[PDB]
């Protein structure tokens, strides 16, 4: 069983997973909507009481299972809890990252396609509409947003061909394994990623128009209202953001950690990776989108831009903004090339869990594990590419509800069923530094309490709407992803039989 070649490689790979489009798109929007600078108070608390502890736990559960030749939760859950039901709950550790990869690699391909377009100068060229319109029409023609009643997407041939190229790039990295593939790429992509971010931050900071300056936007995202704190919605928003940004509950971290040597440090290493992500989010991420947008639209509208959604901000607003500044074309290319590496380092992280299962449990060669996974993903993605709101449906069940539920699940199994003391000693073993003793109570009582509340709130507020309001096409996806869970349950069955 392969291991991470170096300490740095491990950290850069883990950090690579956490760092994502959310650092540059979702955070600025969430921060601006939930109290600006005041949002940092719940954000930091959530990072301490939910973010870090759960990360250490996943890291530990991964390294624990790896020592016995297991990198996926169906097996690992069974180790921590010898019970038939534990293996089924573990199937989610395969289902979640798989379903997410089905629509995420496609979303990822978009950024590449835009990057290719901006690079070739094939991008489109008064009021805020005649400037945004050419780009909205560009995006909708790309991903094939329906101009008719039918719930059918009509992706451009270019969009489709780019998805194949993106799938290929992913396979090229994964098929080389952990150290010679994921790790080797991580050591290159991460520095590259931070260089593009910093460069953009600087270039954006030098933006000025009669309507506002980039510094204005910075003096808005960080000017604390301190009145939203009373609103419990902000605390829920903060815990959510923290949970999403650290990529917790995907089972991806567990799989990555399973390649860590049995008593190699995970406390300091995990803390480092998490810090890299928080720097790329609050410092780098929260200094490109909003500031650049505010620079042109003005301090005024600041709310609207954030409210307009995290997606419209990155794929419509900014590109149009760039096409207005000098040399903004090359500037927009750097933006999407940044978002592409951001996604590329994460897509390989969520496709690995499936690969690991095939290797460890079904004893497939890396080549066969990677290709078969690639096939399952590529095929399944056609449902997301051609069926409207399919992406949204998957993102909710797996990428939203699923991740939180699974997060609370793995925490209860490891710290309650497995044993609080045993779990604590497992986490700290080999640690360059020891986990603060206070965290023993946090992990055992606090962390699970926050997650339970986040689930109860998101459930009572989201599920009834999804079940009733949504179009009937929604079932074609539900049917398919339910089938995927049944499929994985069958593979786990065959694994135990062999």
């Amino acid at each position, epitope marked *: 069983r392969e291991h991470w070649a*170096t300490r740095l490689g491990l950290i850069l790979a883990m950090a690579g997973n956490a760092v994502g489009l959310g650092n540059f798109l979702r955070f600025p929007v969430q921060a601006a909507e939930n109290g600006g600078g005041a949002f940092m108070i719940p954000y930091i608390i959530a990072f301490l009481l939910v973010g870090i502890p759960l990360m250490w736990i996943e890291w530990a559960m991964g390294r624990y299972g790896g020592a016995q030749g297991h990198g996926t939760t169906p097996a690992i859950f069974y180790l921590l809890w010898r019970n038939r039901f534990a293996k089924i709950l573990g199937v989610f550790g395969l289902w979640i990252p798989l379903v997410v990869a089905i629509y995420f690699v496609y979303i990822e391909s978009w950024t590449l396609g835009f990057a290719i377009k901006f690079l070739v100068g094939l991008v489109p060229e008064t009021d805020p509409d005649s400037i945004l319109r050419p780009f909205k029409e560009f995006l909708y023609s790309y991903i094939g947003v329906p101009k008719g009643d039918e719930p059918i997407l009509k992706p451009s041939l270019f969009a489709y061909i780019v998805f194949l190229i993106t799938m290929f790039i992913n396979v090229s990295i994964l098929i080389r394994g952990i150290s010679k593939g994921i790790e080797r790429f991580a050591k290159i992509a991460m520095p590259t990623l931070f260089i593009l971010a910093v460069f953009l931050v600087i270039r954006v900071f030098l933006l000025e128009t009669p309507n506002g300056t980039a510094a204005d936007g910075l003096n808005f995202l960080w000017t604390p209202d301190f009145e939203k704190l009373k609103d419990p919605g902000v605390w829920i928003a903060a815990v959510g953001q923290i949970f999403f940004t650290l990529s917790l509950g995907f089972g991806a971290i567990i799989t990555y950690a399973s390649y860590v040597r049995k*008593d*190699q440090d995970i406390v300091l290493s995990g803390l480092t990776a998490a810090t890299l992500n928080e720097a790329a989010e609050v410092i780098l991420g929260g200094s490109i989108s909003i500031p650049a947008a505010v620079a042109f639209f003005g301090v005024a509208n600041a709310v609207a831009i954030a409210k307009a959604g995290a997606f419209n901000l990155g794929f419509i607003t900014l590109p149009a903004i760039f096409s207005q500044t000098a040399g903004g074309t090359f500037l927009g290319f750097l933006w999407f090339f940044l978002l592409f590496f951001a996604g590329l380092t994460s897509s390989i992280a969520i496709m690995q869990p499936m690969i690991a299962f095939l290797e460890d449990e079904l004893k497939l060669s890396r080549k066969h594990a990677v290709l078969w996974t690639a096939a399952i993903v590529f095929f399944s993605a056609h449902l997301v590419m051609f069926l409207n709101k399919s992406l949204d449906e998957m993102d909710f069940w797996a990428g939203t509800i699923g991740v939180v539920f699974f997060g609370l699940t793995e925490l209860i199994i490891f710290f309650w069923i497995f044993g609080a003391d*045993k779990a604590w*000693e*497992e986490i700290n073993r*080999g640690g360059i530094i020891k986990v603060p003793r206070i965290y023993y109570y946090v992990m055992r009582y606090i962390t699970p309490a926050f997650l339970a509340v986040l689930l109860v709130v998101w459930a009572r507020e989201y599920i009834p709407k999804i079940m009733e309001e949504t179009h009937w096409t929604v079932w074609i996806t539900r049917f398919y992803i339910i089938g995927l869970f049944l499929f994985l349950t069958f593979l786990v069955f065959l694994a135990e039989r062999r």
Partner: antibody
Amino acid sequence: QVQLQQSGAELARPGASVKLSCKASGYTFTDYYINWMKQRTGQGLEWIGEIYPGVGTTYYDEKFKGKATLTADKSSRSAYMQLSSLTSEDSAVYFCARRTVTMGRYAMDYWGQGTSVTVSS
Amino acid sequence: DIVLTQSPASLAVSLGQRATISCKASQSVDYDGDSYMNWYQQKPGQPPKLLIYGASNLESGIPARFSGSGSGTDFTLNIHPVEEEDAATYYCQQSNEDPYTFGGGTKLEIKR
């Protein structure tokens, strides 16, 4: 004053079972592993396996698993090893040792005086 | 298993001279900058004693006469100058992967 003390001079008839002990002190028992060594008179050292008392997990050399059984009581800072279905070839000296977990230095820095097991009728 | 082969099996050196044991591993014992090769000294009747860890690191309490070197698969134990009390068997040991393995051991004879 890191010290590992072992039971001594155990004698047992062929087929019977024996259980060596290893009382540790002078350090945090949970932060380290305790492993076992077999050394026959006039021969080299054999690694039997190890255990992390802090969690309880055990590791064996495929040769010895079934023959040896590693346990440990975290409370008494003590570690045990049971040898089953004893043979004349189980007659040897058995060392328990503390293996460091800090990196990069996984080594045994403290040993017990060793236990001489004799299997005869 | 990573088999360790020591050489020579037996060695005789004078009270002023240098003693050199070598340990050849079947495969690399290195990992992320560190070399997990260890050296032990065993006098008759008592347990082994940690001389060198990490291939080149002198264990606290051990005389500077003992030094370690090498990496990958090649390692050598150096005792200089040799003393009457250096009479013992020496083992090399790898901690790279389970199971842990020892070298055949080299009996050091002090020439008088």
